Amino acid sequence: ATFVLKEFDALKSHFNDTVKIILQREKKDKIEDLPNPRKEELQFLTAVLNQLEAKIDELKPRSLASYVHVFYGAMLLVCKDVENNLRVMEKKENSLLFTRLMDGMGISDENIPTSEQNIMFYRGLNKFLNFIYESNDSRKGLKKEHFLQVLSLKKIYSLAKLSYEQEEAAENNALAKLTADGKTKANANSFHVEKPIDSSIVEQFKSWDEMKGALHQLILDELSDKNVAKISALSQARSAQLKFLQTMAEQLDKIPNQSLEPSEKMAILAGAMYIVRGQIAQEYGKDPLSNDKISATVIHTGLSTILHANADCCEDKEVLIAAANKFIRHMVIERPTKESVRENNMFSDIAGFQLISVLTLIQNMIKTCRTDAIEACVTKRKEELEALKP
């Protein structure tokens, strides 16, 4: 027996009862007369529910499973927000909202959602939240009228940031549970992308051949700076990072173009460069996506240069890192019942390589890109609203 999800109308009718219970107990007529945080928590959930029903009417889905996933994600996000907003010696078990929401989802001490369900909830909610951006594209900012506009800008930011963090944690937990006993061999030629990458995102890298040449020159630079002749003669951390980049480029170069276009190879290699850049930044105590100049890592400075990392937007970074994530997982994670890491994979001969650490770092960078995007968007909207006061 595994956890069974409540269905959509069961969640909806239980949630609406929850609102009625809270309003009667507070002697209020409507949600907007409640005090915060409960006010905004219930406005968030009501707004999510209303947008879900509007999308059911527009898209006419065969089944509501994806809508159930978003609503679970949103309710669990509020439950986490309730915990985070608890004062003194307040206990979540005495929160009417926390206990009602958990009851509505069917969650108790002995019955909790699976790892796979938790990932689907937050992955689904995070995709859903993009409906607040013009064309669902945070590069364009918030819509002038969006489905969360009842909320303060600060609360939109804090809830989205929390949700990106919950997905990161759920994916990290799944990564931590993997065993490395997969017996299958990987097939690089069976890897295909779902959507073609916007070639304007990789245009900065000129071409597949020039990108390999920039990487080759950068490695020569690090050899020349350290006055050694081979990558294996560098410190192990830097040695394994450069070996990882060379291994990614060699593996992509073998894939026939009709199977994987050169623009997609450029995207995967750029994402791999963001990974190495991020690992080096962490050695210096900086965020992986730091834009700080680091006084003298030839490699970190050089990757920043090849990537135009200081000039590229966070959405572009996320696309490139997500591209590398997809290719790496195709090559190292076998799937059906359980996923596992392949015993023999394209990184097996890199001494000291930490594959789970790399996949966990990817989750961190994706989270940061998403958080940077919503921060930028609510900050711009705040600025626009202040400029239109009397």
Side-chain angles (χ1 to χ4, degrees), residues 348-363:
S348 289
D349 289 314
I350 300 174
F353 189 71
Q354 310 283 346
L355 167 73
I356 296 299
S357 174
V358 165
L359 293 171
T360 299
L361 170 62
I362 287 168
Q363 289 301 315

Side-chain angles (χ1 to χ4, degrees), residues 13-29 31 34 38 42 95-101 103-104:
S13 61
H14 194 282
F15 169 71
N16 284 335
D17 282 352
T18 290
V19 174
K20 285 180 183 165
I21 291 170
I22 290 173
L23 289 173
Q24 171 181 303
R25 174 176 168 269
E26 296 259 26
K27 291 190 178 64
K28 293 308 183 291
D29 187 36
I31 292 302
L34 290 171
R38 296 297 186 257
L42 290 177
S95 162
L96 179 61
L97 179 57
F98 182 95
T99 56
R100 278 294 300 186
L101 289 180
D103 283 345

Side-chain angles (χ1 to χ4, degrees), residues 206-222:
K206 282 122 72 183
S207 76
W208 178 236
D209 297 340
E210 295 182 82
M211 194 171 197
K212 296 183 304 172
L215 174 59
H216 185 258
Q217 187 56 54
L218 180 58
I219 290 172
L220 271 304
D221 290 6
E222 170 73 352

Side-chain angles (χ1 to χ4, degrees), residues 90-126 128-194 196-325 327-334 336-338:
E90 297 187 325
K91 294 290 276 165
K92 70 193 181 190
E93 293 75 6
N94 307 133
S95 162
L96 179 61
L97 179 57
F98 182 95
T99 56
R100 278 294 300 186
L101 289 180
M102 286 292 170
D103 283 345
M105 284 182 280
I107 298 174
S108 63
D109 281 330
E110 271 196 343
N111 200 34
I112 71 168
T114 64
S115 169
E116 296 74 23
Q117 288 167 333
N118 280 333
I119 292 168
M120 295 192 290
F121 300 156
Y122 287 110
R123 197 189 278 176
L125 178 59
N126 287 339
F128 184 81
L129 290 173
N130 291 329
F131 287 132
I132 66 181
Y133 303 119
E134 187 68 26
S135 308
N136 311 321
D137 181 3
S138 56
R139 298 172 188 81
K140 297 175 170 194
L142 297 174
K143 292 179 162 89
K144 172 178 153 299
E145 296 183 330
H146 63 82
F147 82 94
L148 292 182
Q149 64 190 355
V150 66
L151 297 179
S152 73
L153 287 172
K154 174 173 190 48
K155 190 65 177 197
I156 291 165
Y157 166 78
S158 74
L159 285 176
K161 173 181 186 273
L162 190 57
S163 194
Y164 303 138
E165 287 168 348
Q166 295 286 262
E167 179 177 341
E168 182 191 18
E171 292 278 19
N172 282 347
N173 177 66
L175 287 169
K177 303 302 187 178
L178 293 165
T179 58
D181 58 2
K183 304 290 178 162
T184 62
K185 302 278 207 312
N187 181 17
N189 302 317
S190 69
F191 179 71
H192 311 109
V193 301
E194 304 178 351
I197 189 184
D198 188 5
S199 53
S200 64
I201 296 173
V202 293
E203 178 199 334
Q204 47 183 314
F205 311 122
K206 282 122 72 183
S207 76
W208 178 236
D209 297 340
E210 295 182 82
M211 194 171 197
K212 296 183 304 172
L215 174 59
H216 185 258
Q217 187 56 54
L218 180 58
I219 290 172
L220 271 304
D221 290 6
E222 170 73 352
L223 300 178
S224 175
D225 187 74
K226 298 299 178 302
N227 197 21
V228 301
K230 279 249 249 221
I231 286 171
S232 51
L234 304 162
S235 81
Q236 179 154 88
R238 206 67 73 250
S239 179
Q241 287 156 1
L242 297 183
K243 194 168 179 183
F244 158 84
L245 294 173
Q246 168 179 347
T247 296
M248 290 280 273
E250 283 175 359
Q251 183 77 58
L252 292 165
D253 220 14
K254 293 182 175 186
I255 304 165
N257 274 7
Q258 46 275 17
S259 202
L260 189 68
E261 322 81 280
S263 289
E264 306 286 354
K265 301 178 177 176
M266 299 168 69
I268 294 162
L269 185 56
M273 289 175 179
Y274 271 107
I275 288 164
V276 168
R277 183 176 175 264
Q279 294 173 309
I280 294 167
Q282 293 180 299
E283 297 173 21
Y284 288 84
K286 297 178 180 294
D287 192 271
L289 286 168
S290 184
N291 282 329
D292 295 356
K293 185 78 172 48
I294 305 178
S295 276
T297 297
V298 169
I299 292 298
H300 184 273
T301 298
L303 294 176
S304 301
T305 298
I306 289 171
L307 292 173
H308 309 90
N310 288 13
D312 216 351
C313 64
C314 58
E315 292 87 0
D316 282 1
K317 295 182 190 170
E318 187 190 354
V319 162
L320 297 172
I321 290 160
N325 186 54
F327 179 71
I328 290 169
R329 286 171 175 267
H330 179 86
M331 300 297 297
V332 307
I333 302 288
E334 81 168 44
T337 193
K338 247 211 311 186

